[PDB]
Structure formats: structure tokens, C-alpha cells
Amino acid sequence: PAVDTAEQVYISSLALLKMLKHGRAGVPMEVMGLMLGEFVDDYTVRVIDVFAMPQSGTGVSVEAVDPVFQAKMLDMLKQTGRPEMVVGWYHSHPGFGCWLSGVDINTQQSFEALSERAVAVVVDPIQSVKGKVVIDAFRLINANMMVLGHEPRQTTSNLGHLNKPSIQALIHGLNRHYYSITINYRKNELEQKMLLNLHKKSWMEGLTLQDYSEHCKHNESVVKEMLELAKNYNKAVEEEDKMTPEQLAIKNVGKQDPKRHLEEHVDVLMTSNIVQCLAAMLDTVVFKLI
Template sequence: MPQSGTGVSIEAVDPKNVGYVQANWTVPKMVVGWYHSHPGFGCWLSSSVKGKVVIDAFRLINPQMLMLGQEPRQTTSNIGHLNKPSIQALIHGSNRHYYSIAINYRKNELEQKMLLNLHKKIWTHGLTLPNFTEHTEINGKNVKCKDLDLPFLPKKFCFFDLLMKKFRTMLTLAEPYNKSVQEDSTMTPEQLKTRYVGKQDQKRHLEESGRRYVQ
């Protein structure tokens, strides 16, 4: 629906929709499919919304709380909902005069199944042949046989550049983990309680990297 806005007002009226509503006397109210507000004209979040669907929830920050250094957010956990603000939003006072609120949607069982199947691979994906140009490039790299300085591979080994990078990453994570396991066997239970405080968990990083590379 096209919108037109000025400094003090914004109109979101579709002429075709207005004509349809006027012709249909059973509808008591005029229906407009877009809502926009500027509380106290402190937030100006959008410059052009033609042809877009904008869903954004925000709340103004109390200046007194900001001066006292208090956290204005009622919900501080935005895991899975945190979006990096644009430069235009920061200029207009994002995280200074207002902050975004995490949005949750109500979905029934059928809607959840539909969203889960949105990017699901179909059965014909397994019958698709690889790209000829990419396959030729991979074969050319295999023929060149680059040297790998890895202890668990032969000195001369034909492999892809991507897999070479993955092997080196796994090796850099496996070496400190192997060393830490050997050192743990010589420590007392009291020493083990504070051994990994403030340090990187090598085992977890190794598991996550292996799981990510397998996928």
C-alpha cells in the first residue's frame, strides 16, 4: 500500500481499498493495513516505506534513568531477536532516546510446519548433478597436489583448499585440548576446580567446529 507523509502527518490510504469499502456497506469501519506513530516526535524510524512491510517495536528511554546509568530495558535477553541498528537509526537516537523490543509471533501447529518446510530440500535435490565449471576447477586443484604440513596426512596429498583450511583449524584446536587433557591427569581435584576459570573451553570449540564442518 503506498504511503505519503509530511512533517506532522502520515497518510496510508489505498484508493482502491477505499472504493471497495464504500461500495460494501456491510463494513462499518474503514480498514487501513498500516500503522505508524511518532511518540512525542522523538523517533523518526523510517524515511520511505513504499512497497515494504515494516514491523518494529520500540520504547522511549527515560532521560533520568539514562543519567543514573540504569538499564532501561525490562527484558535484557535478546538472544535470537537482536538486530544490529542501521546508521540512520543510530543518527536518529537508537539506543540513546529509544531501544528496540524483541517481537514474538503467535503461530499455530500448521503455521509452524509450513515455516519449517520453507527451505527444506525436496527429493529431487539428490538427483541434481554438480555444476560442471565448479567440478572442473576442483579436479584441477586435485591434480596439482599441494604440500600439507599435517602429521596425520601424507606429505603429498591432493585436497581442496576449503578442506585444507578446515584441517588446519581442527589441528589448532586439537593440540591445546590434547595438552590440557594430559595436564589434567596430574592435577589434584582442588586444582581442577579453578583450572578453566576465565579460559577458553577447547573441548567445546572442537566439538562445535567438527559439527559445523560435518554439516
């Protein structure tokens, strides 16, 4: 019964944010926690929620799992509608990629003895940027099976080889002592609409008019900036006429481009004045005494 390469680990929206928040706050400690969820089948591992284990002391490494903290947190989470078993553990790798070290391999073996399908999720809060989180799910490769000449997992699909392994992970034992499980994200309409409220400006701000004294001064200063930029823009036009195509860009390094700054000033000023004008016009009839 070899595990399938098409196995997927599903991380909920709540779970992903908790490890990112816990991992970032614990930078650079390899802060660990337990992933609650359910092994739906031989091909799916759902991570409904996670919770963070405390750090026993100083040291940038994964500490031993505290059994009293785990058991009495699991017991107390069951009271508020979370009767979900532990499907693995997560820990942070603050900036040096997502892989498993020697200590991480030993920690995973503790989970593998209890649950054979335990998943080691590594999250990189430092390398994670907006729209792309550096995450990976790992499960150990048994040395006895692979040494004798057996692949760690069967490949009955194309699903598990869509993500090219990183060289940093391949260096640190990927595909040698552990394998990567493809991570898919479970997002619903409800949670997705709720997250859309982030940075949603209040209705008061839309109709609020900017101070006209500062608006005119900003109008004043930026227009004065184009006065010098236009003077420099004229020089840039003549200079580029008599100037070789190898220096079309090299000569632009270290020297400001009047054309680029003129566009930015025009773009900034056009939205500043149009919005102020439209907001003033809307407020004229919306807030009327008659």
C-alpha cells in the first residue's frame, strides 16, 4: 500500500494565517505548532485549524512537543466545536526556504509513529510575499524501503510533479530523506468576502474633501516641480537625438528621467484634482439645505 504522489494537503484560510502570524512573530525561532484536521482519504489531508506550541526557551530550532500543553489544548478545543485530531505539525523557516533539517526529521518521526500519514508543514514568513506564500508539506522517506531499490511513493498521476523542487530544498534532503506533498488551499465565498474588508475605506472617507489649503499648496508645489522638469525634458529630447543606441539606457542609469517624473507628476495631479472636483460636486447636491 504505497502512498500516492497525487496526495494533497488542504490548508484552510484560518490555518494559513495562524502559521504565518505565529511564524513571523517567532522570527527567527523555528516556532512550531500542531495542525488539526482530518485524513479524508488516502489522497487528501485537510488542515482545518492549527494552534501554536509555546517556546520552552531560547534557541533557533524546533523544541520537543509539550504533551501537557497539547493534550489539554486539544481537550479544551473540543469543548468549542473543534473535535479534530492532530494530522501533523507546522513550524517556521524564517527566510531560508521550506525544507526539513536533522532535528525536523526526528520531530516528524515522533508524529509518524503515532499517525503514519502525519504531515510536516514548513512555512517561510520572511520569503512569503503578497499573493505567494512560501509553504511546503513534507513526509519522511523510510530509509529501509528506498535503500533496497523502491521509490518512496507511487506515481499514478501528474499532480505531484507540477511544482519543481527548489535547489535549497534538494540540498537539505528533499527526495532523499523526505518528500514534498502538494499543498492546495480551501477557500470559500464567506471567508473570502470577509477578507475583502481589509483596507476597505469608510464611507465617510469617500465623500470627505481634502483640505483646500493643502490641496492648493500641493497643486502649487507639484506644478512648480514640472517647471524644472519641463526645462530638463527639453534637454533630454535634444540629447537623445545625437546619442548612440548603446547609451539609450546606460546613460539613463544614475540620472533622473524628466519624462518619467513628468508623467508621475501629471498622473498624481490628475487624480488629485479630478477626485477633489467630483467630491466637491457630489457634496453640493447631496448635502443641500433645500
